Design a protein around this ligand. Structure first.
Ligand SMILES: [Ca+2]
Length: 75
């Protein structure tokens, strides 16, 4: 997804600050769309990191954030 202010914050704020909110944003989508996947997605975020989603979640006009679960659990 894209939002001008969220895009700028995600690219300028402290690394740990953005990383913590990315995880919370993903878990919120998991709770809404695949609530039983909470423990599994949490395990995948810890092993694979979340900062690789810095661009697609806040700066990408061509990424639908609903697809973040499939992105995380896929290879
Ligand atoms: Ca992965």
């Amino acid at each position: 997804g894209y939002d001008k202010d969220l895009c700028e914050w995600s690219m300028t704020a402290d690394q740990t600050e953005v990383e913590t909110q990315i995880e919370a944003d993903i878990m919120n989508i998991v709770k809404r769309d695949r609530p039983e996947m909470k423990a599994e997605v949490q395990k995948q975020l810890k092993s694979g990191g979340v900062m690789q989603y810095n661009y697609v979640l806040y700066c990408d006009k061509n990424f639908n954030n609903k697809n973040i679960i499939a992105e995380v659990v896929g290879e």
